[PDB]
Amino acid sequence: TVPVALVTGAAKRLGRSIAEGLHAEGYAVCLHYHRSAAEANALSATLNARRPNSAITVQADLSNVATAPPVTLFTRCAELVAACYTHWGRCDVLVNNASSFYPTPLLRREAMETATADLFGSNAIAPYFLIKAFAHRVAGTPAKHRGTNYSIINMVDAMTNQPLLGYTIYTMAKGALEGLTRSAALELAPLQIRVNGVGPGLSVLVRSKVPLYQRDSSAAEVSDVVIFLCSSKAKYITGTCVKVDGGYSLTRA
Amino acid sequence: VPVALVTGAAKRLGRSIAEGLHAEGYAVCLHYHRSAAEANALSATLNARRPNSAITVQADLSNVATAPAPVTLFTRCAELVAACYTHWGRCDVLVNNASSFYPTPLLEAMETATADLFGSNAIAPYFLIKAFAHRVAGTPAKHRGTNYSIINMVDAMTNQPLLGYTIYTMAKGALEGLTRSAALELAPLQIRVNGVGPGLSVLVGHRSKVPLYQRDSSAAEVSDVVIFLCSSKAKYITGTCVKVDGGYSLTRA
Amino acid sequence: VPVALVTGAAKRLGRSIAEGLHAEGYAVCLHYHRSAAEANALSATLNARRPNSAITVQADLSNVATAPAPVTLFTRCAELVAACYTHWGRCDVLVNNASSFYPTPLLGDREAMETATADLFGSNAIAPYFLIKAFAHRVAGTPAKHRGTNYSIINMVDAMTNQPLLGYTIYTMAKGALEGLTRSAALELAPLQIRVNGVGPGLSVLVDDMPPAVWEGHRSKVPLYQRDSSAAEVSDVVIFLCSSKAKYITGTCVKVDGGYSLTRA
Amino acid sequence: TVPVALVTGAAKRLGRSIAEGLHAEGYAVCLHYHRSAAEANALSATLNARRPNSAITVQADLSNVATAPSAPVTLFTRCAELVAACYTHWGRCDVLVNNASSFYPTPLLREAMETATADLFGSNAIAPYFLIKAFAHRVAGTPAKHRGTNYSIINMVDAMTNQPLLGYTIYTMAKGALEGLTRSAALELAPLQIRVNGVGPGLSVLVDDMPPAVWEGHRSKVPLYQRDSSAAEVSDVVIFLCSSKAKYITGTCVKVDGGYSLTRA
Ligand SMILES: NC(=O)c1ccc[n+]([C@@H]2O[C@H](COP(=O)([O-])OP(=O)(O)OC[C@H]3O[C@@H](n4cnc5c(N)ncnc54)[C@H](OP(=O)(O)O)[C@@H]3O)[C@@H](O)[C@H]2O)c1
Ligand SMILES: NC(=O)c1ccc[n+]([C@@H]2O[C@H](COP(=O)([O-])OP(=O)(O)OC[C@H]3O[C@@H](n4cnc5c(N)ncnc54)[C@H](OP(=O)(O)O)[C@@H]3O)[C@@H](O)[C@H]2O)c1
Ligand SMILES: NC(=O)c1ccc[n+]([C@@H]2O[C@H](COP(=O)([O-])OP(=O)(O)OC[C@H]3O[C@@H](n4cnc5c(N)ncnc54)[C@H](OP(=O)(O)O)[C@@H]3O)[C@@H](O)[C@H]2O)c1
Ligand SMILES: NC(=O)c1ccc[n+]([C@@H]2O[C@H](COP(=O)([O-])OP(=O)(O)OC[C@H]3O[C@@H](n4cnc5c(N)ncnc54)[C@H](OP(=O)(O)O)[C@@H]3O)[C@@H](O)[C@H]2O)c1
Ligand SMILES: C[C@H](O)[C@H](O)C1=Nc2c(nc(N)[nH]c2=O)NC1
Ligand SMILES: C[C@H](O)[C@H](O)C1=Nc2c(nc(N)[nH]c2=O)NC1
Ligand SMILES: C[C@H](O)[C@H](O)C1=Nc2c(nc(N)[nH]c2=O)NC1
Ligand SMILES: C[C@H](O)[C@H](O)C1=Nc2c(nc(N)[nH]c2=O)NC1
C-alpha cells in the first residue's frame, strides 16, 4: 500500500526537505506552494522521474482572506486535501509547514490588516482548516478501508517562549499552532490520528550562539525528525512538541 | 487618580476586576458588548460611591468590520483607549478580560465563530495593547504615569484542552504569546504585561474535581490576584502567567 | 496572632520575607545556619517593635547527620517546626528560603563532592520536603476546631533554572526537585487546605564581588528596568501569596524576574 | 565501527527493550542490574549468542549510600566503575541511558525514611549525575582524533510528573531533578558534542497487581488507543534519539504518553 503525504510550502528549504524525506520513505507527495511555482514544479519533476506518479503540485494562498474564483480560506484548505483524494484516493500524512515571517512592531492601515491575515492564516488558521478537512475525510472512510498510520505534523518554533523582538503576530500565531497541536491530538485520538509538533531553532539561515555546534541546522537535521514522527515506530507519541534547536532555548542573554 | 480599562466588565469576573480596581482608587472604563443594562447599573453604583469614577463604552471585539466606510476592529480598539484619554486624560491599566467561549468541533457559521473567538480572545487584545502602548509613547516622559500594567485573562486549563473547543484553546494560546512578546517589547516604557489564568470560576460534578476546596472559585478569588498584579508591590513582575485554579491543572484523568 | 517559620531568615531575601510577614502581624521564627549575629540583631529589632514576636533557631539543613546516636536531617527539620509550637502553640506559614549556591562542574577531595551534594540537595530540596512533612503532620494532629484558617507554604524557586547557569548542575537539579515538591505537596495537602506555591526570582540583590562594568553588564540583561531586583520586590510577592486574598492559588510557581527568562543569547 | 552503550536497569521491561533496540542497531551493550542477576545474565547470553562479545553485565546499587568493599565505597566510585567497565572491556562508551529507577510511595500524611530518600533520589537523579560526570570525563580525556562521532545520553523521565501521582513526592521530586540534569548537562557538554535528552513515558507495561476492572479503568484513560504502551513503543524513541539523524536535538524531553498528559480530572 502506497501512502500519501500533503506538505504545505513544500517548494524550498525545510518544506522541500520534508517532502524529499517522506518521498524517500515511499510516500506519494502533494507539494503545496504559494508563489514558488517554478521550484515546486522542478521538485515534482525530480520525484516523478525517480518514481512515476509519486508527486503533484497544488497552489493556494493560505492567508486568512477571500480570493477570486469569492473563495474562502476554508474552501481552499478543503480543496488541498481533496486534491490528494481525487488523485491518489487517500491522505495519510499532513505536514503544516507553510509560514510567513516578518515584523509587526508594537511601537514605531491596510498593510497591518493583510499582515494579520497573512501571518495568522499561514501559521494557525489554515492549519486548523486543513486538520479539520483531513479529519473529516478519515471519518467519512469506512473503518475497514482506513489507513493504519495517520500523522499530522505542525511546524512550530523552539524559540517563541523567548520572543524575537518585534515579531508579535508571528509569535502569537505559533502559540496558537501549539494549542491546535494539543487540542487536535486529544479530539482526533479516537480516529487514531496523531498530532505532533516539530520546533526548529535556527535552520538554514540565508549563529555562534547555538550551544551545539555553534551553527544553524541543515534542512535534513529538522526533516529527519519529522519523518521519524510519521513512522509507525512513533505510534504512541501524540500531542507533543519536539525541539530541534541544538540547545538554543537553554540560553539566556 | 489612575485609570483602568476593563473589557467585558459588565458581569462575573470582569465586574469583579472593575470593582476591585475601583476599591483601590482607580477610575474605571467599563467596556461591554451586549450587556448594556448590567454595565450601566455597575457604572451607576461606582459613580454614586465616588463621582466621575466610571464610564461605559460599547464595542464588538470580534475580528470583523462594523457599520459607522465600515469600521475595522483596530479602529474600535483604538477608540476604546481614546475614550479613557478623552474623558480622564490617561490610561494606566488595561485588563483584557472579554472573551467568547463555545464549541468548534473538529468532527458561514464557522466564519463568524473564527472571527469572534479569535477576535475577543487574541486579536482585539493585540490591537488594544498596541493602542495603549502608543498613547504612553506619545506622552512626554515627565507626564507619564509611574505604574503601567496590562493583564491578559488566560486559562490555567488550556494545556489540558477541553474536548471540542479548539479555536478557543488556540486563541488563549495566542494570548499567552502576546503576554510574552508585549512584556519584552514594552519593558523599555516600563509597561508590565502579565496573565491571570482561572481554572473553574463562578460556574453557571465538575466542581468535585478541584483538589483545593472541591469547588469552583468565587469572582473575588480571581480578581484579587489581578489587582495585586496591578499594584506597585508587583512592579518587578512581567511576562508571567499566574494560575488561579486550586490545583486543577495538577490533575490527570 | 499567626506564626511564620522562615528558613535562612538572617539576611537578603529571607530577612525581607521575615520583615514583610512581621509587618502583616505575624510572629516569626527566624532560622539560621551560620549567620547568628545577623539573625539575633533582626530578632531584637522585631521584638522591640512588638514584644514576643520573634525567635531564632539554628540548624544545618544539609542532608547529613549531626552530633547530638547522631541527629538526622529529618529530626532537625521536625525540631524547627516543633519550636514554633512549643513557643507560640502554632505554625501557619512555612517559607522554604534557605539555599546553598555554588558550582558543581561536570568537567582527599571526595569530601568536597560528598558534602556539596548533601549541602546543595539538602538545603534546596530534602530539608524543604522534611519541613513540609513535619508542618503537615502538626496540622493533621490538630482537631479541626482548633486549626488555623490560612495555612500557606512558599518554596523559593528560580525563574532561570530552565535556562541553566553554566556549571551549576546540582543546584539546578535541586531547584527542579523543589518545583516537583511544590506540585506534589499542593495536591496531597489540599484536603487540609494547606496551600503550596513557589516564588522564583531571576536576579535579586545581585552579589557585586566582581568589576563594576561586569556587574552592570549582568543586570543590564534584565528587560524590565535593566537591573536586578530589590529584596522587597520579591518578598512582597511572597507576602501576597500567604494572604487570604490568594486563598484559591496552589501548586503554582510565580516568576519575579523582570522578564529575564524571556531572553535568549 | 562497533559503538558501545551503557544501559542502567537493563534486566527487564523498558531497560531490556532499550538494550535490545540498541543491540539491533549494532551496539555492544553493557547491561547494568541491581537485583535481577538471573534476568540480566539470560539477556546477555541471548545477545552474545546473536553476536559474540556484544554484551556484558555489571552489578551496582545506585542508591545514594556507601557500600562495603578498606574504606566504604561511595555511590560516585560505583558510578565511575560502571563507565570504566565499558572502557576496560571495549575501549569506549558512546551512549549512556539512565533508565534504572525505584518507584514507591512516600506519603506526606525511621530506617524506612532514610533509605527511601537515598534510594529514590540516588537511582532517579544522583546516580545519573555521577554517571554523566564519569561519562563526560572519559570523553574529555580522549584525544580529539580518537573520539567517537555520535555521543548521546538519554535520561528516562516521566511525562506525568507535572500532574503528580498522589503520595509519590520523593519520586516526583527526583524526576524533576532529572529534568534539570538533562538541560544543565546538555548545555555544559555541548562543546564536546555530547547530546543529552530525555524520554518520558506515561503508562508503559502497567503493573497489574489489582482487580482487572481497576487495571482496565486506569489504561482506558490514555486518549490514544485507551491502553498503556508496549516496551518497544518507548524504546524505539530512545534508539532514534541516539541515531545520527537526531544529532541536532539536545536538552529536550520527549513525551511518549499517548496524550495522557493532556487529560484533566
Ligand atoms: N528556518 C528556521 O530557522 C525556523 C525557525 C523556527 C521555526 N521555523 C518553522 O519551520 C517551518 C519552515 O521553515 P522555513 O524557514 O523553511 O520556512 P520559510 O522558508 O520561511 O517559508 C516556507 C514557505 O511558506 C510559504 N508561505 C509563506 N506565506 C504563505 C502564505 N501566505 N500562503 C501560502 N504559503 C505561504 C512559502 O511558500 P512559497 O515560496 O511557495 O510562496 C514559503 O516557501 C515554518 O513553519 C517556520 O515557522 C523555521
Ligand atoms: N470563568 C471561568 O471558569 C474561566 C476559566 C478560564 C478562563 N477564564 C477567562 O477569564 C475571563 C473572564 O471569565 P468569565 O467567565 O467572567 O467570562 P464570560 O462571563 O464568559 O464573558 C465575559 C464577557 O466577555 C464579553 N464578550 C464575549 N464576546 C465578545 C465579543 N465578541 N466582543 C466584545 N465582548 C465580548 C461579554 O460581554 P457582554 O456580556 O457585554 O456581551 C461577556 O460578558 C475570560 O477571558 C475567560 O476566558 C474564565
Ligand atoms: N538572589 C537571587 O538572585 C536568587 C535567584 C534565584 C533564586 N533565588 C532563591 O531565593 C532564595 C533566597 O535568595 P537569597 O539570594 O536571599 O539566598 P542566599 O543569600 O544565598 O542564602 C539564604 C540563606 O540560606 C541559608 N543556607 C545556605 N545553606 C544552608 C544550609 N546548608 N543549611 C541551612 N541554611 C543554609 C543561609 O543561612 P545562614 O547565613 O544563616 O548560614 C543563607 O543566609 C533562595 O532559595 C534562592 O535559591 C535567589
Ligand atoms: N513504566 C512506566 O509506565 C513508566 C512511566 C513513567 C516513567 N517511567 C520511567 O521509565 C524508566 C523505566 O521504566 P520501567 O517501568 O521499565 O522501570 P522499572 O521496571 O520499575 O525499573 C527498572 C529497573 O531499575 C532498577 N532499579 C531500581 N532501583 C534501583 C537502585 N536502587 N539501584 C540500581 N537499580 C535500581 C531495577 O533493576 P533490578 O531489577 O536489577 O534490581 C529495575 O529493573 C524508569 O526510569 C521510569 O521511571 C516508566
Ligand atoms: C531569523 C530567525 O531568528 C529564525 O532563523 C527563524 N526563521 C524563520 C521562521 N519562520 C518562517 N516562516 N521563516 C523563517 O525564515 N522562524 C524563526
Ligand atoms: C466549565 C468550563 O471549563 C469553565 O468554567 C470555563 N468557562 C469559561 C471560559 N471562558 C469564557 N469566556 N467564559 C466561560 O464561562 N473558560 C473556561
Ligand atoms: C548569581 C545568579 O545569577 C542569581 O542572582 C542567583 N543567586 C542566588 C541563588 N541562590 C542562592 N541561595 N543565593 C543566590 O545569591 N540562585 C540564583
Ligand atoms: C503506575 C504509574 O501510573 C506509571 O505506569 C509509572 N510506573 C513506573 C514509574 N517508574 C518506575 N521506575 N517504575 C514504574 O513501574 N513511573 C510511572
Looking at the CA of residue D206, tell me the nearest atom of ligand 4.
3
Count of CB atoms situated within 10 Å of the CB of B207: 11
Burial code of A43-75, b = ≥16 C-beta within 10 A, e = fewer? bbeebeeeeeebbbbbebbbbbbeeeeeebbbe
**Gaps in chain C following residue numbers (C to N > 2.5 A):** 68, 107
The HSE-up count of residue C41 (CA atoms within 13 Å, CB side) is 7
Residue B154 near residue B241 (C-beta atoms within 8 A) = yes
**What is the rounded CA–CA span in Å between residue C202 and residue B23?**
32
Residue B194 near residue B228 (C-beta atoms within 8 A) = no
Amino acid making up residue B91: C
Q: Which of A100, A199, A92 shows the shortest CA–CA distance to A154?
A: A199
Residue D261 near residue D161 (C-beta atoms within 8 A) = no
Looking at the CA of residue D101, tell me the nearest atom of ligand 8.
12
Cα–Cα distance list, C81 to B217, C154, D113 (Å): 31, 15, 18
Q: Which residue of C has its CA nearest to A209?
A: C265
Helix (H) / strand (E) element for D55: namely strand D55-59
* End-to-end CA separation in angstroms for chain D: 50
Grid coordinates belonging to C227:
537591573
Would you call D223 and A211 a contact, using CB atoms and an 8 Å cutoff? no
Residue B248 near residue D265 (C-beta atoms within 8 A) = yes
**What is the rounded CA–CA span in Å between residue D143 and residue D148?**
10
SS (H, E, C) chain A: CCCEEEECCCCCHHHHHHHHHHHHCCCEEEEEECCCHHHHHHHHHHHHHHCCCCEEEEECCCCCCCECCCECHHHHHHHHHHHHHHHHCCCCEEEECCCCCCCCCCCCCHHHHHHHHHHHHHHHHHHHHHHHHHHHHHHCCCHHHCCCCEEEEEECCCCCCCCCCCCHHHHHHHHHHHHHHHHHHHHHHHHCEEEEEEEECCECCCCCCCCCCCCCECHHHHHHHHHHHHCHHHCCCCCCEEEECCCHHHCCC
Q: Which of B19, B20, B125, B1 shows the shortest CA–CA distance to B73?
A: B125
**Gaps in chain B following residue numbers (C to N > 2.5 A):** 68, 107, 204
Tell me if B18 is assigned to a ligand binding site.
yes
The HSE-up count of residue A230 (CA atoms within 13 Å, CB side) is 29
Neighbours of chain C (3+ CB pairs under 8 A): A, B, D
Count of CB atoms situated within 10 Å of the CB of D50: 12
Helix (H) / strand (E) element for D34: namely none
Question: Alpha carbon A134 to chain centroid distance?
Answer: 13
Q: Which of A244, A95, A189, C250 shows the shortest CA–CA distance to B161?
A: A189
**What is the rounded CA–CA span in Å between residue D102 and residue D88?**
28
Nearest to B250 among D163, D221, D262 (CB): D163
DSSP-derived secondary structure letter, C11? S
Give Cβ neighbours of residue C141 (< 8 Å, ≥ 6 apart): none
- List residues near ligand 7 (CB under 6 A): C 99, 101, 158, 165, 203, 206-207
Count of CB atoms situated within 10 Å of the CB of B103: 12
Q: Which of A193, A96, A91, A202 shows the shortest CA–CA distance to A154?
A: A96
Q: Which of A182, A162, C44, D13 shows the shortest CA–CA distance to B106?
A: A182
Count of CB atoms situated within 10 Å of the CB of D23: 22
Q: Are strands C194-201 and C253-256 parallel, antiparallel or unpaired?
A: parallel
Tell me whether residue B161 is exposed, middle or buried, using C-beta atoms within 10 angstroms of its C-beta: 0 to 12, 13 to 18, 19 or more: buried
Grid coordinates belonging to D260:
495522557
Helix (H) / strand (E) element for C126: namely none
**What is the rounded CA–CA span in Å between residue D198 and residue D184?**
12
**What is the rounded CA–CA span in Å between residue D142 and residue D152?**
16
Taken in order of first residue, the domains within chain C and their CATH numbers are 1-265 (3.40.50.720)
Tell me whether residue C193 is exposed, middle or buried, using C-beta atoms within 10 angstroms of its C-beta: 0 to 12, 13 to 18, 19 or more: middle
DSSP-derived secondary structure letter, C72? P
Q: Which residues of D touch A (CB under 8 A)?
A: 183, 186-187, 190, 193, 195, 223-225, 229, 233-234, 236-237, 240, 245-252, 254-259, 261-263
Instruction: Give the three-class secondary structure for D198.
Output: strand
* End-to-end CA separation in angstroms for chain C: 48
Looking at the CA of residue C207, tell me the nearest atom of ligand 7.
15
**What is the rounded CA–CA span in Å between residue B253 and residue A49?**
51
A92 lines ligand 5 (CB under 6 A): no
- Contacts of residue D260 in chain B, CB cutoff 8 Å? 252-253
Grid coordinates belonging to D38:
538471573
Give Cβ neighbours of residue D70 (< 8 Å, ≥ 6 apart): none
Q: Which of C156, A156, C200 shows the shortest CA–CA distance to B240?
A: C200
Q: Which of D190, B1, B26, B211 shows the shortest CA–CA distance to A212?
A: D190
Strands across the sheet with C93-96, in order?
C54-58, C27-32, C3-6, C93-96, C151-156, C194-201, C253-256
**What is the rounded CA–CA span in Å between residue A123 and residue A154?**
9
**What is the rounded CA–CA span in Å between residue B39 and residue B84?**
16
Q: Which residues of A touch D (CB under 8 A)?
A: 182, 185-186, 189, 192, 194, 211-213, 217-218, 221-222, 224-225, 228, 233-240, 242-247, 249-251
* End-to-end CA separation in angstroms for chain A: 51
- Contacts of residue B165 in chain A, CB cutoff 8 Å? 183
Grid coordinates belonging to D258:
499517548
Grid coordinates belonging to B65:
468590520
Residue with cell 458581569: B11
Residue A168 near residue A253 (C-beta atoms within 8 A) = no
Any idea which ligand is nearest the CA of C38?
3
Residue D199 near residue D252 (C-beta atoms within 8 A) = no
Distance C7 CA to ligand 3 centre (A): 9
DSSP-derived secondary structure letter, C122? I
- Contacts of residue B248 in chain D, CB cutoff 8 Å? 264-265
DSSP-derived secondary structure letter, D164? P
Give Cβ neighbours of residue B219 (< 8 Å, ≥ 6 apart): B12, B13, B15, B16, B201, B202
**Gaps in chain A following residue numbers (C to N > 2.5 A):** 69, 108, 206
SS (H, E, C) C133-180: HHHHHHHHCCCCCCCCCCEEEEEECCCCCCCCCCCCHHHHHHHHHHHH
Tell me if D225 is assigned to a ligand binding site.
no
**Resolution stated for this PDB structure, in Å:** 2.4
Looking at the CA of residue B35, tell me the nearest atom of ligand 2.
40
Tell me if D13 is assigned to a ligand binding site.
yes
Phi-psi region of C193 (alpha: psi -120 to 50; beta: other; left: phi over 0): left
Residue nearest to atom 10 of ligand 5 (CA): A101
Q: Which of B152, B169, B159 shows the shortest CA–CA distance to B229?
A: B152
Q: Which of B100, B94, B102 shows the shortest CA–CA distance to B152?
A: B94
Would you call C237 and B237 a contact, using CB atoms and an 8 Å cutoff? yes
Rg (chain D; Cα; Å): 18
Cα distance from D166 to chain A (closest Cα, Å)?
24
Residue D262 near residue A186 (C-beta atoms within 8 A) = yes
Give Cβ neighbours of residue A115 (< 8 Å, ≥ 6 apart): A102, A104, A169
Helix (H) / strand (E) element for C196: namely strand C194-201
Amino acid making up residue C11: K
**What is the rounded CA–CA span in Å between residue D243 and residue A21?**
16
Instruction: Give the three-class secondary structure for D214.
Output: helix
Q: Which of D46, D85, D241 shows the shortest CA–CA distance to D151?
A: D241
Answer positive or negative: Cα dihedral of A108, A114, A116, A121. negative
Would you call C186 and B237 a contact, using CB atoms and an 8 Å cutoff? no
Would you call C236 and B239 a contact, using CB atoms and an 8 Å cutoff? no
Q: Which residues of A touch C (CB under 8 A)?
A: 159, 161-163, 209, 248-253
Grid coordinates belonging to B53:
469614577
Tell me if D78 is assigned to a ligand binding site.
no
SS (H, E, C) chain B: CCEEEECCCCCHHHHHHHHHHHHCCCEEEEEECCCHHHHHHHHHHHHHHCCCCEEEEECCCCCCCECCCCECHHHHHHHHHHHHHHHHCCCCEEEECCCCCCCCCCCCHHHHHHHHHHHHHHHHHHHHHHHHHHHHHCCCCCCCCCCEEEEEECCCCCCCCCCCCHHHHHHHHHHHHHHHHHHHHHHHHCEEEEEEEECCECCCCCHHHCCCCCCCECHHHHHHHHHHHHCHHHCCCCCCEEEECCCHHHCCC
Tell me whether residue A108 is exposed, middle or buried, using C-beta atoms within 10 angstroms of its C-beta: 0 to 12, 13 to 18, 19 or more: exposed
- Contacts of residue B213 in chain C, CB cutoff 8 Å? 190, 193, 248
Of residues B102, B168, B236, B248, which has the active-site annotation?
A: B168
**What is the rounded CA–CA span in Å between residue D244 and residue D232?**
20
Q: How many CB pairs under 8 A join B and D?
A: 32
Cα distance from B23 to chain A (closest Cα, Å)?
31
**What is the rounded CA–CA span in Å between residue D55 and residue D6?**
10
- Helix runs in D190-225, H state only: 212-219
